[PDB]
C-alpha cells in the first residue's frame, strides 16, 4: 500500500509468527492476529483489527493464513501514530499538566472509555507504569518508554 | 367596611364616629393652633400647624383659631385640617369606603353647604354624603318624633319645633348666642375680680372654669343677693400655673347671658322666650304637645339648673293648664351625634344620600335638592 | 440528566415560573445543584446525600466547569484554580436564608480543600480547627427565630491561606456583623443566643451554684422576651456537651473555660438589675444580689460596677466629673454593658481561633507570598410579617453585598470586553447606588435619621423618629410610609411603618424598639471600670488604650455600618464567586417543596435579575493558549500540537468545530463564547474524542504488553 | 476628619473642640498676656503672670479684637492642633449682644480663619441639648454674663429672655474688694487670678444668708485657710458666703437689678400661663459661676417663695454645669438636620457679614 | 375757693388741676424714687423718699418706682404719697375742700375703684368724687357727643365708641401695651447698636429717646428696605453724661409695636384693627358716623404719622364708600384732663358725685351704682 514489503522483513514477520503457528498449520486464530502484530511492535486498535477481519472472515474457520496477516501489516504500516501524539492523548487527562498521573486515575481511563484494558492488563501496566511504587506514572517518560 | 360616618361639625368640639355606635370616638376641639414663636430647637420635629388635641395640649406657644364660628365655616382651609385630623388620625379611616353625614344649623348661608359638598366630593372623594340640620337629630336621639328643640352649642343656639315628624320651617327660631359668647363674657366678668384672661390660650382656661364653676340661677335676683351677703356662694379654682382664683356672682351671671342676651349688648330675648315664641308661632292644636316635649341638646344647655329655670320661665309664659316639661338627657352634650348615628342607621335613609354620581350630574348646588 | 443545570440555557428566562418549575424538576429527582453561569444555585435536600465523599472530590478536582453536573466541588475547584494561576486573592460568597445550608456548605468546602491540596497534614490541621471550632461559634453567635431554630446572626468570614507553591500555609477567621441588639431583647417568639439556654439546661450543678444561677430561664430577664425559654426541637441539654467539647478541642484551659462562662453568666445577671429613681429621679441599683455575683464573676469591684451602672464620666480640664443617669439611661447603659460584654467576648473567641491558625513561617525572606481562599457565610434578605431594627440592618447587609456585587461583578465584565476590545453594548441595569445612599449617607440616609433621634433632646420615640423619615427622605422614589403612600397602597401598609423598596422588592419595617435598639450608650466610666477587671478575658476585651477615645459612644446602627464597611473592604481586594442557597420548606422535611417560599427565595435572592444580565452577556472565556490545548484534539490542523500562534491556532479550530459569527469572539488575548450551548456542545464533541485518545493509548499499551516478556 | 468645630468663646474661658466628643479638648483662659515673645495666651500667660494680662471679652462681647484674633489663633493653630479651612465652626454668644460682635465674628471667621462655613448660637439653648430637654428655663451663668433663656417644646420666648451683666468676674472684683477688710490686698491683673482660685475652691451659697452671718459672727466653725503662692497664708471667714450673695443680691456691687432667682421667676412670669408649670420643673443651671455648693438648694428654696404653693419646683445643675454650653454645641453640630443651617462662604460672597441676623 | 379738682392719674404721668381751667395745672411723673446707696454727709437734707419732678431729677441715686402698672395701682402707699404730693404740694390745696373727680380705664378690678374711694374719702377725707372712664372724657374735649375713642396712655391702649352720648359696653377694647411697653421694647431694640440701658433711671433716658427721635413709618417694609440702603434716617442723641449715640430704624421699629403687638410677643390685634374690631361690634347704622370720628388721645399717640398710618390701616379694612377720618388735635397728650374739666364744670354733672354722706350710708361698694 503505502510502501511493500522487503522479502527480508517478509521474513522476519514469518519468523515471529512462527511462534503463534508452531506445529506448522500456516494460520493464527482473527484475534491472535492483534498478538502478532503487537509482537512485531505494531499498535493496532481492536476496531481496526475488526475492519481489517471483516475482509477476510467471510468463509469462517475462525482463523486467517501467513499471506493474508502479511497483507493486513501492510494495511497498518500506512499511518501509524507518533510518539508527540500519544503523550499528548495522556496530557489531556492530566488534571495539573504536570506530566504526572495516578495509577487509579489511570485505572478509571483504561476501564472507563472504549476499548477498555481488563483488570489484568492493568495490573500488568501498573506494574511499571508507576516505575518504583509511588503510585504515580510520569506519563511522558512512559510514552517514551512505551514507544521503544 | 361600608358603614356611615357620622360628623358633627360643631362650632367647639368635632364630634365623629360611625353610624350604629352608641357614643363618638372622636371628640376634640374643633381648633387649628400655630406656632406663634420662635423655633430655636433644630433638632425636634415642629410642626407649622397643630389641630384638635394636640393644638390644645401646646396651647401656650400656639395662637389656636376656630375655622368655625356661629354654625358657619370660615376659614376653609383650616376646616379641611381639621376633617383630614378626624378622617385620618382620629377615626383612621379612608372616606372614600364611607358615606358621611354631615351636621349643618337652621337658617345658614347656602353656600357653607354647597363647600361642604364641593370638599366632601372633590377633595376628601366621599361615596355618598347628606348635612342634616341638627336639632332635627336631637329629635331621634331623644326617641321622639314630636316636640321642640332647644340646640346650644359653642356657636349657635337654635329652636326647631317638629310634630308628628314634620319640622315647622316658618317657626324655627335662630339665636347667634351660645357656648363662646358665654366664654367671652366670662372673659370680660372675670376681669371686674382682677383675673386678666386675653390671649387665645387663655380663653381655654375661661372655658374650663365656666364647664366646671357656672350654673343658673332658679332665680337671678335672689342668686345676686345672696352672693352679695356671704361667700356661700364663691367657689375656688387653680390655673395651670397653680394660682388659685376664687369666683362668686360670675358663677351665675355668665349663664344668665343665655336668658338675658343684653348682657353681651344684644336686642335678642332669651333662650325662654325664644322657646314660646317658636311653639306660639306654631298652629294652636301642636302646642300642647310641644310644651310637654321641650327637648334639651348641646354642650350650653350643661349647667346645673337650667332645666329647672328653664321650666319655671316657660311656666310664667304658657297658660296655666298646660303641663310644660322639659327633657334634658344626661348625654344632651352628644344628642346630636347620637341622632346622626340612628338617622345613618336608618334603612329608609339610604334613598336619601346625595351620592358622588349626582354631584357629577348637578354641580355642589345638588344639596340643595335632598 | 433531569432538568436544564444551567438557567441561562433556558428559553423562557423572563418568566419566574420556568425557573421555579425547573428547581422543583431537579431537585425532586435528587440534583440539588444548578447553575446560573458562574453562580451556584444550592437547594437544601434535609436528608444524607452520600455526593460529598472523597470519591467525589476525586471525580471534580481539576474537572473544567462544564463536563459535570454542578456541586461546590465544581465551584469550589474554580476559585481554586483561579488563586492557584493568576495568583490574586478570592472570595466565595455563600448566602441564602436561615437553615438553607451555608454552614453546611462551608463544612463541604474545607472537606475538598483539604483533601485535594498539596500538604494534606497542615490541610487536615485547617480544616480540623475551623470545623471543631464551629459549635462554639454557633453557641455564641446564633439564635432561635419565628423561622429556624439556628439562625446565623452574624456574617463568618474564613480563609484558607495559600503560597505560590499552591499548599495551605495557614487559615484566618473573622465575624463581621454580630447582631448585638438580641443579646436584651429579642422580638415574641424569638430566644436569645444558644450559648445561656445550653448553660442553664446543660451546666453541672456545681458550675451553676459557682455562677449563681438557677436552671429556670424564665428567672433572667434577658431570655424571658422571646416567651419561647422551652422548645421541643432543640435539645439544650445535649448541644452543651459538643460546645463544651469544641471550648477544650480549641485548646482552652479549664481556667480559660470558667473565666468564659462567668461572663455568660455575668450577662445572665446584668439583666435582673433593677433601677429605682432617688428624690433627684437619679438611678439607683435597688438589688445587691446581682452585684454580690457580677464583683465575683466580671472581677470587677462592686462598688465601682454599682457606681459605673449609675453614673457617667467625662474628662475636662484633667478633672474628672461624674454625671448620674436617669433610670431610662442606666436601662441603657446596663443593656450597652451587656451588649459591649458579649460582642467583645464573640471577638474574642473568633481571635482566640484566629490566632491557631496563623502561618508558622518566619515571615520574612524568602517569604514573598500570600494568597487568599476566603469564603463568607452570611444570610440572606431577611423578611417577615414582623420585621424590626435586625432586619433592617441584615437587609442593610444584603444591600451592599449586592452593591458590591454590580462593582467587582457586573462592570468588571463590561472592562473586560473593552479590555480584550470587544465592540458590544453594554447590559442594561438597576444600580443600588441610590438605595444605599438612602440607608447610609452622611447626613441624608436612614441610619444618619435613627442616630440623631437617639441624640436629639427632648421626648424622641418611635414614631416621632417615622414622622423625620418622613419630612427628610420626603421625595425619593424608594421610600415609602402610610403618610406618603396612595389609597391604593395605604391598605398594605399601617401607621407604625414604613416601606423601602430594596434591589429585589419591597421590605416593610415596623419603627417599634428603633430607639431602644439602636442605643449603645457604653459610656467610659463602664469601659474603664471593665479595663480594670481580674477576669483575664475581660482585661484583653477592655484595654487602657481604648479610654483615649474622646467620642460619645456609637448606636448600634453606626457599629453595624462601620463593620460593614469593613466586611466590602476585606471583599472589595478580591475576585468574587457566589453560592445561592434555597430552603425548600419552613419546617425542615426531605423532598417536600413549598413554592410559596421557594417563590419568596427566588425574589429575594434575586435570581431572575441575575439570569437576565447573566444571559444578555457572554457565557465564557479563555486565554487562547487555555482554549487550543484543551480543545485541539477535535481538529487535525491543530493535533497533536500547533505550530502557529495561539490565536491563529484557535482562528482554524472554531472553523473546524463550525462556530457562527453571533456565538463566539476573537478578543485581544482572550476566545468568548457567547451561549453556553456552543460550548456544551463542543464539551460533548470533546467527550467522545476522548475515546479515540483512549483507544490509541490502549493500542499502544498492547503493542508493548507482549515485547517485554517474550523471545 | 472634617467634622464641625465647635468653639464656646467664653467671657472667662475657651472651651473648644469636636463635634462629637464628650468634653471640649482645650480648656484654657481668654487671657492674652504681654510683659510688662511679645504677647503669650491662655495657659501660657496664666503661668508666666509676673504679664499684664488681659481679657478680650467683656460682659460676653469681644471688646478688643486683636487680642481675640490671637485667641482664635491660639485655639485653633497651638490647642487643637487644627487647620480651620478644613471644619465649619460652630461659635457661641450670649442673648441680647450688639449686633457688631456677630458680624465681625463672622467676618473674621471667614476673612482671617477661611473657614468652610460658621454658625452663632445662643448659650443658653445650647445648654438646654446637654441636660437632654426641649422644655425648660435655662440659668446660664459664665465669667461675664449670666441670663435667662425659657424655651417650650423647643420655641424660645424672646420677650421673656432675661440678661443680666454681672456673673463670675464682677464676684471675683467683689471678693477682691472684701479680702481688704481683712488686711489681704489684691490690686494687680495677677493677684485677680490669685482671688479667682480663692472664689473656686473657698466660697459657697448659704441656705440662709443672716444665719449664716450670725454663725460666722459668734463663731470660728466657719472659717477657712488659703495657701498663697508666695508661701503666706490667708484665712476667709463670712466672706465664703458674702461673695456669692452677690448673685442673690446684687446690690453689694451697687447694682441696681433683681436676683439671679428673682430674674429666673420674671422669666417665667413673662411666659404664657399654660407652659409655667413645665419651667418650673425644669429650671437648668449651666457656667461656671453655678458651681457653688449650695447654689441649687438656695436657688429651689428661693423660687419656692415666690412660686405658688401646689408647683412642684426642679432645679437641674448637673455635675458638669460647667461645659453643658459646649456638650450642648457637641450634640447641636452633629445633628443631621442641623448641617443646612450653617452660613456657608458662598453665601457670605453674595451677602456680606450681615447675613448672620438672617441665618442665626 | 370749693370749685372742682380734676386728677387724671395716668399710668405714667399725673395731671391735675381745677375744672376752671384750659390745661392741667401740675403734670408730673407718677414715680416714687427711694434712695439707693447709703448717704455720707451729715447735714445733707437727703428725703426717705422722693416724688414727680424732684424723684426725675435725683434719679442718679434712686430706684424709680411707678405705682400704677396697667391702669391698676399696683402699690398703695406709694399712691396715696403720689396724690398727697398732688394736692400738697403741686396743687397748693386741701382736698378736703374740693370734690375731686378722677379717671379710670374701662376694664379694671373692681377694688381699683373701690379703694380709689376709700382713699379718697377716709384719707385725703375729700367731700365727693366720682371716677370717669378715660376714653368717655377725652370725648367732651373733642367737642362731640359721637366718635370712637382710641386712647393710649404710658400703660393702656382702649377702645370706647360711644354714638349721641351712649356708649356700647360690649364694643369696648382693652390692650395693656402703650408707652411703658413700647420704652421697655425701646430698650431691648437699641442692645443691638451695643447700647446697654437697664436700670430704672435710664429707663427714663430711653423714654426721653423715644419722645424726640420715634415715628411711626407710614409703610413699615419700605422704611426698613429704607433705612437698611442709607444712613438718611439715622438720628443722634447726646446721652446725659455727654455721649452721642446713633439710632436708625430702631426710630420706627419702636411705634411699629402697637401695628404689630407680636414684636413684645403680645398675641393681640394692633391698635388699627382693635378700632376696626370695635366699629364692627356696634350696630351697622352707628358705623359710618364711628368711622368718621376716630378720636385719638394720650401721649402714646403722639408720634408723627401715627394719624396717618391709622387713617391708612384702617381704609385699608373698612368699605371703600366710608369716609374715615380721624381725630388727632396738638393738645391729645391732655385731652383726657381737658374732658374732665368740662365733665367736672357741667351744672347737670352736679347730683353725679359720690358725696360724703352717700359713702357713709354705704361703704366703697357705693361706687358701682354711681360710676
Ligand atoms: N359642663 C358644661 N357646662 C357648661 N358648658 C359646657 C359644658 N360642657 C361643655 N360646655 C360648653 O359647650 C360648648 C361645646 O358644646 P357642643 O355641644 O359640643 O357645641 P358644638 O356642637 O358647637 O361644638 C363649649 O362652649 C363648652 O365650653
Ligand atoms: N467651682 C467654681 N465655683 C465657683 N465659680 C466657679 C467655679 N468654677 C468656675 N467658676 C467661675 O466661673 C467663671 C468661669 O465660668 P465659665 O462658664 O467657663 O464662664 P465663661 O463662659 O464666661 O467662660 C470664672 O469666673 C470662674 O472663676
Ligand atoms: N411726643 C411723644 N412721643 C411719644 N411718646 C410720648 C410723647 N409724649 C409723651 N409720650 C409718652 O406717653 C406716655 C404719657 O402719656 P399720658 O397720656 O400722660 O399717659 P398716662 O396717662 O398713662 O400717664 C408716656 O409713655 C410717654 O413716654
Ligand atoms: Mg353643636
Ligand atoms: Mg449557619
Ligand atoms: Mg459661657
Ligand atoms: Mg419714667
Not at chain 1, 511492535?41 to 483489527?49: D, K, V, W
Not at chain 2, 430647637?41 to 395662637?63: F, N
Not at chain 3, 439546661?201 to 430577664?221: A, C, H, K, M, V
Amino acid at each position: 500500500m503505502a510502501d511493500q514489503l522487503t522479502e527480508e522483513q517478509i521474513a522476519e514477520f514469518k519468523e515471529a509468527f512462527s511462534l503463534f503457528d508452531k506445529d506448522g498449520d500456516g494460520t493464527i486464530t482473527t484475534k491472535e492476529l492483534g498478538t502478532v502484530m503487537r509482537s512485531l511492535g505494531q499498535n493496532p486498535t481492536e476496531a481496526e483489527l475488526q475492519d481489517m477481519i471483516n475482509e477476510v472472515d467471510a468463509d469462517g474457520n475462525g482463523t486467517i493464513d501467513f499471506p493474508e496477516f502479511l497483507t493486513m501489516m501492510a494495511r497498518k504500516m500506512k499511518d501509524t501514530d507518533s510518539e508527540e501524539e500519544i503523550r499528548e492523548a495522556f496530557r489531556v487527562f492530566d488534571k495539573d499538566g504536570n506530566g504526572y498521573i495516578s495509577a487509579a486515575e489511570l485505572r478509571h481511563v483504561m476501564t472507563n472509555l472504549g476499548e477498555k484494558l481488563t483488570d489484568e492488563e492493568v495490573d500488568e501496566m501498573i506494574r511499571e507504569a508507576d516505575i518504583d511504587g509511588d503510585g504515580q506514572v510520569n506519563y511522558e517518560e512512559f510514552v517514551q518508554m512505551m514507544t521503544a | 367596611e361600608t358603614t356611615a360616618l357620622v360628623c358633627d361639625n360643631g362650632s367647639g368640639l368635632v364630634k365623629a364616629g360611625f353610624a350604629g355606635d352608641d357614643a363618638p370616638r372622636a371628640v376634640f376641639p374643633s381648633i387649628v393652633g400655630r406656632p406663634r414663636h420662635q423655633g430655636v430647637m433644630v433638632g425636634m420635629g415642629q410642626k407649622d400647624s397643630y389641630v384638635g388635641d394636640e393644638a390644645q395640649s401646646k396651647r401656650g406657644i400656639l395662637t389656636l383659631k376656630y375655622p368655625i364660628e356661629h354654625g358657619i365655616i370660615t376659614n376653609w382651609d383650616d376646616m379641611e385640617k381639621i376633617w383630614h385630623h378626624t378622617f385620618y388620625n382620629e377615626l383612621r379611616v379612608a372616606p372614600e369606603e364611607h358615606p358621611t353625614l354631615l351636621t349643618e344649623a337652621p337658617l345658614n348661608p347656602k353656600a357653607n353647604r354647597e363647600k361642604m359638598t364641593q370638599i366632601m366630593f372633590e377633595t376628601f372623594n366621599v361615596p355618598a354624603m347628606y348635612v342634616a340640620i341638627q336639632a332635627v337629630l336631637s329629635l331621634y336621639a331623644s326617641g321622639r318624633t314630636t316636640g321642640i328643640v332647644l340646640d346650644s352649642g359653642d356657636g349657635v343656639t337654635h329652636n326647631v319645633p317638629i310634630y308628628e315628624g314634620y319640622a315647622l320651617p316658618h317657626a324655627i327660631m335662630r339665636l347667634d348666642l351660645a357656648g363662646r359668647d358665654l366664654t367671652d363674657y366670662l372673659m370680660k366678668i372675670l376681669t371686674e375680680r382682677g383675673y386678666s384672661f386675653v390671649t387665645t390660650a387663655e380663653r381655654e382656661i375661661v372655658r374650663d372654669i365656666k364647664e366646671k364653676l357656672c350654673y343658673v340661677a332658679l332665680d337671678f335676683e335672689n342668686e345676686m343677693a345672696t352672693a352679695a351677703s356671704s361667700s356661700s356662694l364663691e367657689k375656688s379654682y387653680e390655673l395651670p400655673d397653680g394660682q388659685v382664683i376664687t369666683i362668686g356672682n360670675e358663677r351665675f351671671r355668665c349663664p344668665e347671658t343665655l336668658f338675658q342676651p343684653s348682657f353681651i349688648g344684644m336686642e335678642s330675648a332669651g333662650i325662654h322666650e325664644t322657646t314660646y315664641n317658636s311653639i306660639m308661632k306654631c298652629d294652636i292644636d301642636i302646642r300642647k304637645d310641644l310644651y310637654a316635649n321641650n327637648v334639651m341638646s348641646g354642650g350650653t344647655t350643661m349647667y346645673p339648673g337650667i332645666a329647672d329655670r328653664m321650666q319655671k320661665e316657660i311656666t310664667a309664659l304658657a297658660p296655666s293648664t298646660m303641663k310644660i316639661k322639659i327633657i334634658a338627657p344626661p348625654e344632651r352634650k352628644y344628642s346630636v351625634w347620637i341622632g346622626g348615628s340612628i338617622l345613618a342607621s336608618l334603612s329608609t335613609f339610604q334613598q336619601m344620600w346625595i351620592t358622588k354620581q349626582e354631584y357629577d350630574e348637578a354641580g355642589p348646588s345638588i344639596v340643595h335638592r335632598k | 440528566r433531569v432538568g436544564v443545570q444551567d438557567f441561562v440555557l433556558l428559553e423562557n428566562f423572563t418568566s419566574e415560573a420556568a425557573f421555579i418549575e425547573n428547581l422543583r424538576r431537579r431537585f425532586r429527582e435528587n440534583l440539588i445543584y444548578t447553575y446560573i453561569g458562574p453562580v451556584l444555585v444550592s437547594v437544601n435536600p434535609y436528608r444524607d446525600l452520600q455526593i460529598y465523599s472523597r470519591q467525589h472530590m476525586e471525580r471534580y478536582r481539576g474537572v473544567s466547569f462544564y463536563e459535570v453536573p454542578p456541586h461546590l466541588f465544581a465551584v469550589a475547584d474554580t476559585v481554586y484554580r483561579a488563586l492557584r494561576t493568576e495568583r490574586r486573592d478570592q472570595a466565595v460568597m455563600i448566602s441564602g436564608e436561615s437553615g438553607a445550608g451555608k454552614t453546611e456548605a462551608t463544612k463541604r468546602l474545607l472537606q475538598f480543600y483539604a483533601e485535594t491540596c498539596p500538604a494534606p497534614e497542615r490541610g487536615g490541621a485547617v480544616r480540623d480547627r475551623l470545623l471543631q471550632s464551629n459549635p462554639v461559634l454557633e453557641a455564641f453567635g446564633n439564635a432561635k427565630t419565628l423561622r429556624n431554630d439556628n439562625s446565623s446572626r452574624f456574617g463568618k468570614y474564613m480563609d484558607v491561606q495559600f503560597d505560590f507553591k499552591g499548599a495551605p500555609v495557614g487559615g484566618h477567621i473573622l465575624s463581621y456583623l454580630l447582631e448585638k441588639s438580641r443579646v436584651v431583647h429579642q422580638n415574641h417568639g424569638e430566644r436569645n443566643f444558644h450559648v445561656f439556654y445550653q448553660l442553664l439546661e446543660g451546666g453541672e450543678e456545681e458550675t451553676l451554684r459557682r455562677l449563681g444561677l438557677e436552671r429556670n430561664p424564665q428567672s433572667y430577664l434577658y431570655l424571658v422576651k422571646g416567651q419561647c425559654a422551652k422548645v421541643s426541637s432543640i435539645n439544650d441539654k445535649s448541644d452543651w456537651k459538643v460546645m463544651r467539647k469544641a471550648l477544650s478541642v480549641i485548646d482552652f484551659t479549664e481556667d480559660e473555660v470558667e473565666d468564659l462562662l462567668s461572663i455568660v453568666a455575668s450577662v445572665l445577671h446584668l439583666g435582673n438589675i433593677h433601677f429605682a429613681a432617688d428624690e433627684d429621679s437619679n438611678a439607683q441599683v435597688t438589688t445587691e444580689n446581682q452585684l454580690k455575683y457580677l464583683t465575683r464573676l466580671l472581677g470587677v469591684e462592686g462598688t465601682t460596677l454599682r457606681e459605673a451602672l449609675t453614673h457617667r464620666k467625662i474628662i475636662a480640664k484633667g478633672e474628672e466629673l461624674l454625671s448620674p443617669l436617669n433610670l431610662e439611661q442606666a436601662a441603657y447603659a446596663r443593656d450597652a454593658l451587656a451588649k459591649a460584654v458579649y460582642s467583645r467576648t464573640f471577638t474574642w473567641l473568633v481571635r482566640k481561633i484566629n490566632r491557631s491558625l496563623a502561618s508558622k513561617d518566619a515571615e520574612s525572606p524568602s517569604w514573598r507570598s500570600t494568597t487568599v481562599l476566603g469564603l463568607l457565610d452570611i444570610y440572606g434578605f431577611e423578611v417577615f410579617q414582623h420585621n424590626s431594627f435586625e432586619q433592617f440592618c441584615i437587609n442593610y447587609c444584603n444591600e451592599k453585598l449586592q452593591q458590591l456585587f454590580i462593582e467587582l461583578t457586573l462592570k468588571s465584565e463590561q472592562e473586560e470586553y473593552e479590555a480584550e476590545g470587544i465592540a458590544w453594548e453594554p447590559v442594561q441595569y438597576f444600580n443600588n447606588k441610590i438605595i444605599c445612599d438612602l440607608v447610609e449617607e452622611k447626613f441624608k440616609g436612614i441610619i444618619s435619621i435613627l442616630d440623631e433621634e437617639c441624640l436629639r433632646p427632648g421626648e424622641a420615640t418611635d414614631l416621632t423618629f417615622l414622622e423625620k423619615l418622613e419630612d427628610t427622605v420626603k421625595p425619593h422614589p424608594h421610600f415609602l410610609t402610610h403618610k406618603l403612600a396612595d389609597q391604593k397602597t395605604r391598605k398594605s401598609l399601617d401607621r407604625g411603618e414604613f416601606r423601602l423598596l430594596h434591589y429585589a422588592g419591597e421590605v416593610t419595617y415596623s419603627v417599634t424598639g428603633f430607639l431602644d435598639k439602636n442605643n449603645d450608650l457604653l459610656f467610659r466610666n463602664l469601659k474603664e471600670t471593665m479595663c480594670s477587671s481580674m477576669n483575664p478575658i475581660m482585661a484583653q476585651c477592655f484595654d487602657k488604650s481604648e479610654l483615649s477615645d474622646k467620642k460619645r459612644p456609637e448606636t448600634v446602627a453606626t457599629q453595624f455600618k462601620m463593620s460593614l464597611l469593613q466586611l466590602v473592604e476585606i471583599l472589595r481586594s478580591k475576585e468574587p464567586a457566589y453560592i445561592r442557597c434555597i430552603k425548600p420548606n419552613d419546617a425542615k422535611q426531605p423532598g417536600r417543596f413549598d413554592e410559596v417560599l421557594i417563590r419568596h427565595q427566588v425574589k429575594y435572592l434575586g435570581l431572575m435579575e441575575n439570569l437576565r444580565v447573566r444571559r444578555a452577556g457572554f457565557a465564557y472565556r479563555r486565554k487562547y493558549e487555555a482554549f487550543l490545548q484543551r480543545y485541539k484534539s477535535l481538529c487535525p490542523e491543530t493535533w497533536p500540537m500547533w505550530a502557529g500562534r495561539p490565536q491563529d491556532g484557535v482562528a482554524v479550530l472554531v472553523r473546524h468545530l463550525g462556530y457562527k459569527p453571533e456565538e463566539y469572539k476573537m478578543g485581544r488575548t482572550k476566545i468568548f463564547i457567547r451561549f453556553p450551548k456552543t460550548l456544551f456542545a463542543t464539551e460533548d464533541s470533546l467527550e467522545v474524542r476522548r475515546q479515540s485518545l483512549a483507544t490509541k493509548i490502549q493500542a499502544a499499551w498492547r503493542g508493548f504488553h507482549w515485547r517485554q516478556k517474550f523471545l
